[model samples]
Target: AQNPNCNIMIFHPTKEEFNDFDKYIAYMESQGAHRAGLAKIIPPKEWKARETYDNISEILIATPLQQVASGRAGVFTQYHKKKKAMTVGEYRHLANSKKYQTPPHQNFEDLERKYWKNRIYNSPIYGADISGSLFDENTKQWNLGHLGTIQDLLEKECGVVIEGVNTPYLYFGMWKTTFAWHTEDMDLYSINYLHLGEPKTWYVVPPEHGQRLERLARELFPGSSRGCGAFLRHKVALISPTVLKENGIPFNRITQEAGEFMVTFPYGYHAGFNHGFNCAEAINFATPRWIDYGKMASQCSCGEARVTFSMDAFVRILQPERYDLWKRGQD
Candidate 1:
């Protein structure tokens, strides 16, 4: 049997359509599209940006190969891997190389079982957080933290960079280089823009299903969950939509192309793989509504216990008058 499709919301790709972009997200939630956990904001045809790295100067790092690849019919496995530094050009060529791309095989088990043995690999330049890029002005306006944008509440109201959380992170994705299923940091909202290249496919389990997925995840990884209720923050497990469907979780799938945007709501569990080599940028943001989520959200005990973002501090800044009143827990 097949799985039911997620009723994802798609915004009209126009300036008029986005007169108040964030409002539409709330509207989507009102319409129950939040059940899909994400919205695809298609940009207008005139929207465009330049993409070239030949003039760059720094040597970069890349996760040269994924010992574990996803999308075929089998269980996912996480294997120990290696990393190396390479120039942008070198990384691009190798990431787009055909050698790493597994050829079609009739006997699926041959390639599937062999790939499981590390015969196949996935190359990606993941987590390139460009806080202040050379593209400076052009990027700032489109930044998720800038004024008039979805997640701008942090930067506009608080006046802080909060790199990675509010800063834009660039990513290089190729076939089978998958990001594991997990919720965003601090259970906040996230937006991703595809600047160029082949499209990427995303799988998201909506906010309402967030806890269900968490329970299922803990069951799947009892060892880790025993240590941390928020173990999914570790982002170590890779589960397929089929498996999730079979396990009784609702999900939505989306394909993002160049000049398009994909937004994940607070507590939305999302994960996806690239179709081929592509360039994309993502950033975490918070809306006024996120404050309640942050207050009740659990901290992850994945590593050395540390607080990355302070919800209480943010609450005091945005709603100082009611801060103490709310702190009394007299609600």
Candidate 2:
């Protein structure tokens, strides 16, 4: 994917050195990419507890076996729904249709309803298995879920390995709904992959300047747009047909493959979007820590949330970004 563009970006280390987190950060910075997402190493025992998750530094990325199968199923189901309703073109039309419109919600439950329209059954917006069947009652853990508690259960039930540490291998789901555009409140490294569907889209600005990006997008798009207006500002600059290109940082379009890498950076902005109509999935692994039952309990109590606030904020921010980008384009 990097063939079309060469911005002197960091080369993701070969398998021989994927365990080198610090080296990766140095390489990224050397190529002008801002370093972010550094956090503390979580002890395996506490990895599942939400209270401790905030304490860990690295965001261990993973594409669990369940996630892969579930995602394939979702795509298959969506394809069937689309096929029965209309042709591929018609499906695209529907994607653009008013029925797919965003709504006001911040939690996952609401987003599930808004985007999926109840066509899918008991699942989160990203189709994470919310069904009680996914969890093991005896073990008090989930086989496929992403809240911090489930994370703990997985480590205990399935056992996971932190790549840097000499331990048994484990799996983690890059739980589709677990991430968002936010600063790293903790200090640690991260390991992620881009498997299945779409090039991951991210916008990086200094953490302090995230608001600036938002304001800029708002001013430029001015009423219902997505992403920062930066895409508009640098039309040809950030285009990623394949091979991770970098206007400022190494934004790699991760393909479907099994690889391991470390990420230890500090303070930048990032948001990703699907390049194609299909959804994306990734695999990640990292250190774990002791569980925080308090946070886990809180999440369980909240149970099946929605995403109204997120949609509102996104639309509000998109308006200006889109307007400005298009305005620039016209000029």
Candidate 3:
């Protein structure tokens, strides 16, 4: 059962509708829509200020490399396969320390074009700080739309809280900075909102084909691990829409513009790259429908456990309470 409509879907939600958190959640969940967008939820001017970048830069430069190594914060480079690792602060230092200049007569846009062209591909950087919320920078908090509300509700209802899972991880990306192909942790859903920057391009394989792609990947990379397959050994693969099409696997491509939200459904294989210097924030959450996938994702060992929860033990403790709630609702 191969479905060819694997293209990423984009939709704009109005400021009013987006603010009405509950309604927004209902619409997204009911549609089973994996990706959505907004022409303007938050203004680019608010987050694009020079001071904001400076604040982020300061945080990066001061944090120790060990903090990043802990999986909480780090910078990734295209040369990761060579075991080369660079800190976010170092990247900021390099970009800022450059002496490149545009002609005095050049306009702002022209200067921007020249600057990005020169700096974007210079060992392009992608830094994600999972603990960014604790850092108070001049940057405005990236709005979560309805995601925060949904997360709060789930925690209240389920009595379970996955700390970093529901929190936003701030991202800094420059041209060619890539996030490798993978699904969200525990098969949970994720929403990424581009705060400010040039559009980011995404390659997505729908949930139905995600597992099949994993199987195909194993065949392609004969000795690779089950979890990451080819991606484990290689920092990044030249996997594009065309590559998937040639392999008889369906996929979708979308350029996520600023202020837009890109949603990834449970088990959806997604990978993308920054087109230019940009900043984005992403977080994960789960719905009632995600229970089965979460259970399965936790147990599956591609190369390592995808999540930390012990599904069997967790269920044994919660099943009775869950049953009681279901029975009470019926009565």
Candidate 4:
């Protein structure tokens, strides 16, 4: 979705190229788009989800937050601590109703006047199986519940059901609902597809700026990071792109419309918020290239947590065929 107004890297793959995920991703690598940490893909127009997920009756008691919207970053947030349960129907009404939607954020300061009464950021939905299930099975593209770990490495080889990695996880969001900066668990790559509704505003600080991002994060939240090496993984802190730029960090700001996919590279830190009501499904999958990131994740300074599953153990079960990528490879 690049043009004179947009700076984020976006690629539109030809039908043949899209099917050849291996060569397509390699082409992205050669084009240097992969280095951006998060790359956007505007899929072929006919690639929309054919099934209906709109009437899901699942209930979620979303946490409330009095968002301090310094522009659109949704940082400086004050949690309401209290919550209430609402069905998807009710949530959708709340999103479009005057109580939450009528107030126009006419200026930067006006954003402070708007607060999300119910914020459903990462509530998992039942259907992560959509993306891979859509006719892309023959493609080399990684999917949440269809490829790499989901069917091959973890499922078939190790026999484990790793949610969001082996299985897909879905979530719904509304205006100003924030997903704080963080990487995928165990430093594996992640892909998020906007299943329906409004565009999601995303900010990604490339892997090269990852350490600097950590430094800034530490500086901003020394109290949180004091003993916790992986404090950033907790999804509490939020930082703006303006703050990042001033701190000498490079970031890409982009909006992902429905039917688009956002790919986060290994160890890539990212955060974003919804423009309005939206539903997204994301899954983590690792390439041979992600193995090293997993190795480093195991050795990381996160003393209190295991990060995620043990990559080395998976490596033990994944011999022979794994070497296909390792000989060329490891993630």
Number of the top candidate by TM-score? 1
TM-score of each: 0.73, 0.30, 0.63, 0.71
Best by lDDT: 1
For model 3, residues 11-31, the per-residue Cα lDDT tens digits are 456544645544555565555
Cα deviation at 290, candidate 2, in Å, is 21
What local distance difference test score does each model get?
0.61, 0.28, 0.50, 0.60
Model 2 residue runs over 4 Å out of place are 1-12, 35-125, 128-180, 187-190, 206-208, 214-264, 276-331
User: What are the clashing pairs of model 3?
Assistant: 68-73, 227-302
From the highest lDDT down, the ranking of the candidates is: 1, 4, 3, 2
Model 1 per-residue lDDT tens digits across residues 111-194:
333433442344333434444332334542344445343235666655754332335667765655667787775677788888
> How many collisions per candidate?
0, 63, 2, 8
Q: How far out, in Å, is residue 180 in model 2?
A: 5.4
Tens-place lDDT digits, model 2, residues 238-310:
1121211222323332222222122323333343322222222222222232122111111101111222222
Give the C-alpha lDDT of model 2. Answer: 0.28
| Residue range with the least summed lDDT across 10 consecutive positions in model 2 | 293-302
Q: Which 10-residue window of candidate 1 scores lowest in summed lDDT? A: 111-120
Q: Which stretches of candidate 3 lie above 4 Å from their native place?
A: 1-6, 35-55, 61-123, 133-142, 145-165, 226-238, 298-331
